[PDB]
Amino acid sequence: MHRTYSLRNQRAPTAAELQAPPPPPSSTKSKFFGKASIASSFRKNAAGNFGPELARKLSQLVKTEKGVLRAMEVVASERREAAKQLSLWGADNDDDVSDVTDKLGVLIYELGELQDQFIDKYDQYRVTLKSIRNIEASVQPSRDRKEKITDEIAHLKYKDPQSTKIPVLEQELVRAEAESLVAEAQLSNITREKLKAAYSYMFDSLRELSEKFALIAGYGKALLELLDDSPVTPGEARPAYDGYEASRQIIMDAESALESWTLDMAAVKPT
Amino acid sequence: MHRTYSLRNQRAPTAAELQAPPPPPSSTKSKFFGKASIASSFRKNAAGNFGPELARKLSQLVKTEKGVLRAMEVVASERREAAKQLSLWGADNDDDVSDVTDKLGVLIYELGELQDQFIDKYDQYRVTLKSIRNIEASVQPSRDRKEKITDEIAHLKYKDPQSTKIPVLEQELVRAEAESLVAEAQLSNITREKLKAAYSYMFDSLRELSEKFALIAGYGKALLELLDDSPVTPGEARPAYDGYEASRQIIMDAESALESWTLDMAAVKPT
Amino acid sequence: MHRTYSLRNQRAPTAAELQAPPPPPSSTKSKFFGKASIASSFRKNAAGNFGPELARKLSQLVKTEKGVLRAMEVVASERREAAKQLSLWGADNDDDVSDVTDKLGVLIYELGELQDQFIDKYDQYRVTLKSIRNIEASVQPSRDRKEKITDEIAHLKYKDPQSTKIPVLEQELVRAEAESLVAEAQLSNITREKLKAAYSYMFDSLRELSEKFALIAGYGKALLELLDDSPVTPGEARPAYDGYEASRQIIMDAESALESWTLDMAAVKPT
């Protein structure tokens, strides 16, 4: 992150914040738990309660992303209702506002739909995180077997070196040594390859959602241009709205840029 | 939106979907209400229960966005925990994975922080939506007075034209006519100006969040390049990690592009 | 401070830590309040209980440094006892150890004495912090008078513009305006000059204590050179100690460098 050289928690303002000062904190700071009700919070402790020690963190990790999915499902679905209600209010308004508002509802509807595709790809990233969780949890019992083996041979050797079980326990240590070694190496291999692929796919989904979000946001700015802000005095009639086809053409250009999106092209060019 | 010429609900695939087929639907389709618990749903009906008829839709609208804010608050805060837990797991892994993972946790932390600023600006857009709700709700009683006036004069005229209250009720109709006319005109004025300003600011916040999201996503892709996917065979040691400063420099370029973001420049260029 | 680009609290190791790994955390983590008993903690809240609002932070600040002084008084005095007890143990040991140990006790005694001078200068810095506290606390009642004045004139003007007290209250606002302005300007002046002088003197005391600490520490390292670590086998006598004058001369050089310390010279040369 970006932080200032001060004991204060507040960081240095961004160049974007220089032009527009940051708004006051949101008035939705509920005086409650604030973390996806109670069942999710109790579930969070349950992952580390009765799971393998090695995979306890991963058992939380994959399921924690389910909390991301469930919360984002509400965001996508409930914001979808906002587009429903927004375009509905356009009726009890003048024609110019009605056309702009319901068109904005279409654009927000697209915002929600793209979000839903993002949650689907997010689920796929969660699924492969579950897969690496599964193999790591399968590795753990071998570690259990190995430490049990060295514990027994150490205890038996301490008791007496003439025990007949130590000749076979020494080979059992070598047994488990090669046993654990082969899949410890592939555990690093599969973790590296799967994490790289999963997060490359996840960031690909993030880039897809991000650029689509930006394209609709900018074209909504162009859509908002057909919104007269003239302060008409009372007693005088309004000229009739005429930008019906102009807003219609704006959507067509939006759809044209929507259906012509390939990963080869990218307006965002990191340095 | 984009839909195909078919009675089927499924739409035509996007060019992005042509390269990568869409993933299967998420496994988080809970068999429950699925809309921000029950209190929000019961609250949604309450807005239209005991409110002014004109502002019933707006009373829902501004408060519905509070449901967006509350749900997004969970998303921002609970995904923030995912960055916490992800970087924590980097300990019980090789050094290369540890450096990449905790750096990814930093980038996701920035993702959450930018989300929080988005919710703050979203609250401001909700607040001005509350303001237009307030004035429209203040307009409603005049409509109540006007229809009551014409109802009384019509009923009195039907009963008898010689009633002494009709001479003053006729002027009362003109009274309320000019009364309602002046602020009906400004109601259209303030609704148009405030909606345009609020949604221009909201789309400005959306563009800000979108481009910042994309910048961090792309630089995370560059960060992921320092992740060897070589399938090392068991029994052979690994060369030591060396991309400590390379990943450090990647963040510096990310911060440099982060602190040098102005609305004058925009990589996204709509056609 | 120096922190790493990770959500982990642990920072990047220093170059000094690279040569010598950091030791495990101290075993003195008492399961108690741990902040200078209870009276100091209760006193800390008392400073902000019944004090002027403007000087509440400074009233804590100057007195908080008394907590530094009281705690450092214990450190200086109780470590002074450690030098007493250390040199005492030198009796029931061989002559070589006895000479080295009691000489080390002398050096630690000097360590304590220099600490005491540091606490004295620390008290002076605390005293001038009390002085700026006093003047700022004296400024506060004028702010009280000014806001009371504007409150009364606003309330009286709201009640009626014909009130006879408003003609004199308007001049009273100008009265307090020039009143507050003259010492607000000097408040900034005196705060800047006094804080600069106090912390320059405080850092001068810190530099004095620091370099004296280092000089005694290094000469103690030279003193420790007269300490044979040979593993003498049992049954063989030891050669008699002879470095009596060598350790005596080491102290003389230490005292010679001690009495020849001027602020013009400084081994520490910041870049």
Residue numbers in the entry:
A (entry chain B), B (entry chain A), C (entry chain C): 1 to 271
Original paper wording:
The yeast eisosome, composed of the BAR-domain proteins Pil1 and Lsp1 (hereafter, Pil1/Lsp1), scaffolds a membrane compartment that senses and responds to mechanical stress by flattening and releasing sequestered factors. MCC–eisosomes are relatively stable, and have been implicated in sensing and responding to plasma membrane stress: various stimuli, including hypo-osmotic shock, heat shock and mechanical pressure, cause eisosomes to flatten and release sequestered proteins to affect signalling or transport functions. Here we isolated near-native eisosomes as helical tubules made up of a lattice of Pil1/Lsp1 bound to plasma membrane lipids, and solved their structures by helical reconstruction.
We isolated MCC–eisosomes from S. cerevisiae using a gentle purification procedure, preserving a lattice of untagged Pil1/Lsp1 structural proteins bound to a presumably intact plasma membrane bilayer in a near-native state, observable as a two-layer density in the protein tubule. Although MCC–eisosomes have been shown to have a furrow-like half-pipe structure in vivo, our isolated eisosome tubules seem to be closed, continuous helices of Pil1/Lsp1 proteins. Using a symmetry expansion and density subtraction strategy, we could refine our structures to a resolution of around 3.2 Å, which allowed us to build models of the paralogues Pil1 and Lsp1. Two novel structured regions of the protein were visible in our maps: (1) a folded N terminus (Nt) that forms lattice contact sites with the Nt of a neighbouring dimer, followed by (2) an Nt amphipathic helix (AH; residues 39–48) buried within the lipid density of the cytoplasmic leaflet of the bilayer that runs parallel to the BAR-domain helices of each Pil1/Lsp1 monomer.
